[PDB]
Structure formats: structure tokens, C-alpha cells
Amino acid sequence: VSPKTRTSNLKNGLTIASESNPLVQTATVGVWIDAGSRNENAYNNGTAHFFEHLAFKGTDKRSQHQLELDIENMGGHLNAYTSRESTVYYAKSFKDDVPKSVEILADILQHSKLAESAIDREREVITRELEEVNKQYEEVVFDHLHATAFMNQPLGRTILGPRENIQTITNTELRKFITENYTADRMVLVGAGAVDHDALVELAEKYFSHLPSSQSPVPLGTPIPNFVGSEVRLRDDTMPVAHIAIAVEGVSWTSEDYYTALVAQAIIGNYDRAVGTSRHQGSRLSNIVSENNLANSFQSFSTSYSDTGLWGIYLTSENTTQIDDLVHFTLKEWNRLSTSVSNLQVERAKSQLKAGLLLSLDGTTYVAEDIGRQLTTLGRRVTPAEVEAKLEAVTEHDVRAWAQKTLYDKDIALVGLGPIEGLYDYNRIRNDMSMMRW
């Protein structure tokens, strides 16, 4: 039984959430923000990512060089990432360097220069990032997957934004973005590891007290996405490995089917030919794929957003003449979530997940990420006892009902990259979403 997550608020509406671990010597403190690229329109798309660069370019007090030195002197590091719905800025340090790190984070978020000279400098760095993501195949595949599934909608936009916007982002629109979005009621200060909650609350009162509150304070993790069945083919015969993602519209964080969808995902599971144990996994798809050498890997996912999600699988394969078999057998295993699954598969997947949801949190950064994610999506940290009860409530017959309304005979979003000549047209893929025998 892990120590209890303590939670306090400030007057502005900033949440402070902490989980202490007296066995470790480091601490991850940071700011989780319920805001990301999805909050941009088409004209300022890329702003959130642009700001992440300039946050480390110097403040009203410390210059870029002074900033570098201050963190070097602390001994730990700072890190940041911007997603579609979430922005994170954290600092890993020593136990007694926590007041320094909170002070630096408060500075870069509230009091950043955003000097025209630095905007102009980063504008090239970010332009170069557009031509180097091209190598990260998984990211290419998932960005096209969002673009097509949420065609012409805010969730469909990339985080980097178009080339055109990068050239036209001003300090004015940067300032406007962070003033509108980085408000106290949307922010959570998180501490995990060697942190005292009461000390962290005092540091929040000292540094984050003059944060703006939004005009209309909605609860944390408050949002209509209209999924498009569609495909993107990025054929490249010179690549040796095909990368394919297939997804349906999945579930939001607060869906009643959230846990049902996780169990369904665990029934298919993951596979990697490079891992020794993968040939012996219980998953039927794993067995088919390994015995027939159909793939190098597959990874089931159930990605959630505030008001929608994507549920599907990501495949990589060198077997270019049997892509058809790989996709065929994958979708036939999904069909069985509707037609065939019983207590045998469901109880097995529940066993595996009851541990998996706890295992994931193995370092202070993972714990902080868990507290921060849950507070910004659900408005609260869900205790392991509650999670164990929600998993236990999932029956085989919940899974069947969920798959019958979510997967069975449904439109898919499909992205193929690489030597995908063997990937059949949309209809033949989508025809495998049902079984004529059932």
C-alpha cells in the first residue's frame, strides 16, 4: 500500500498534489497544465510547442546563460513536453534542491522574456524539426493517424504546426496563448519522491500566487470530435519495414467504458520478436504472429482524450508479402472480442492489468506523471483500491457489449508507411471488421 496522495489548493485555484517516498533521495516537482496544441486555432497552430522552446531562452531576471548555469548548479535537470491536451514542465533534483527548482519553474512560466531575437533564432530550429521527425516512423504514423481520424478538427492538428505558422508566430500571439491557457485553475503543481507536502504548498504560495485565474473556471479535465473512417498511405518501397496503424474511435478519460476498453486492449496485448518471452505469450494474436513470422512487433493502444479516444494497434513488419495475412489475422482477433470472448480471456487480462497499472509507476518521474495526468484529466488521483474495484467490475459480457458497439463492423482509420503494396484497399480491410459466419 503506497502512501496517500495529499492535495491542497491555493486561493487562485492552483492545485498542489504530492506523494512522498522516504526511501528515495531525489524529487520530481513540476507543473501539469490542462492545455496543449488542441487549444490553438488553425492560424496559431504550433504556438504551444513554440513556447516550450522559448521557456528555456531566458526570463526577466536570468538570461539564457544564467538559466543554464542555475540548473547546472542545482545538479538535476529540467524537462518539458507539449501534447494535444496536456503540457508538462518538471524538474528532477536532490531532496534539498526542491525550493530552487520550484523557483526556476515559476520563473520560466510566468516571467519569460519572449524576445524577438530569440523568436527569430528558434524559428529556424523548429523549421529543421519538421524535416527530422520524418525519421521517427512511429511518430509519423501516429501523427497521420490523428490527422485523418479527426479530419479538419483540432485533435487532427500536429503539435509542431505547419511551416507557414512557424514563420509567422509573434511574441504577441505567444503571450496571448500562455495568458489565456496557463491559468491557475488549469494547473497542478506536483511533487513526488523526497518532498514534504506542507513545504511544497508554501513554495506554491511564494511563487505561484500571482497566477491569473480564468474568467469561467471549469473543473480539471473538461473538454465535438466526429471520427472519420479513412486511410493515409505513405508508400515507400525503399524502406525495409512497413509501419501500419489501425484504430477505431475509442473512449475518453471519464468514459464508463474506460476500463472495459483497457481490458479489451490487454486481450490482444503486445508482441516483439526481440523479446525472449514474446513467443510464449497467451494472446491468440501473439501466437499467430510469432508462429507465422508475420511481424517484428505489434502494440495495442487505447489513447484517451477529454471527449474521445483512439483504440487500435500499431504493427511493424518486414514480411512484405504477408501484410495481408497480418492485417487479416489482427482484425479477426478483434472480431472475437465481439463474438467469442468469455471469462477465460477476460479474467486473464484483468489479472495482468491489476498489476500492470501499479508496475508502471516505478520512479519519482513516473509517479509525478501519474499524479499530474490523473489530476488534469479526472480532477482527482484515483486510489489503487478504486482502480482494483473498477477492473474487477469488468465482466466478459461488458467486453462483448463494448466490442459490439465500438469495434464490430465499424469504420477504421488506417495509416500505412513503407513497403505497403501488400496492404489491400480500404474496403477489404474494413470488411475484416465483421465475420460473415457470425
Binding site: 486511410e231 484497399d425 480500404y426 474496403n427
Partner: protein, 53 residues
């Protein structure tokens, strides 16, 4: 008239069955057009973006 009947005594039945066939086949032709267009729309609607390597 009688001799025409003598040459083709199936005449009356044949034309009535033909009416039934015409109706069924016409309806099936209309439906086959809808179904073909439905199945073909992903191919017809396909769009390309080319970036020369």
C-alpha cells in the same frame, strides 16, 4: 387470333411472367448501381499529394 394462339399457346402466361421479371430485374439493376457506387467511392474519391523525393 385463334391460329396465333395455336402457334404460341404460352403467350398469355409468358407475358405475365415477363412483367414480373422486368420489375424484379429493374429493381435489382437500380440497387446494383447503388451498391457498386457505394463500394467504389473510396477509389473514386482518392486524393494524392506528391512530394518528389
Amino acid at each position: 387470333a385463334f391460329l396465333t394462339w395455336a402457334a404460341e399457346p404460352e403467350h398469355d402466361e409468358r407475358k405475365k411472367l415477363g412483367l414480373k421479371a422486368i420489375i424484379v430485374i429493374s429493381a435489382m439493376l437500380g440497387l446494383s448501381v447503388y451498391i457498386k457506387k457505394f463500394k467504389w467511392s473510396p477509389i473514386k474519391n482518392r486524393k494524392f499529394i506528391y512530394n518528389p523525393p
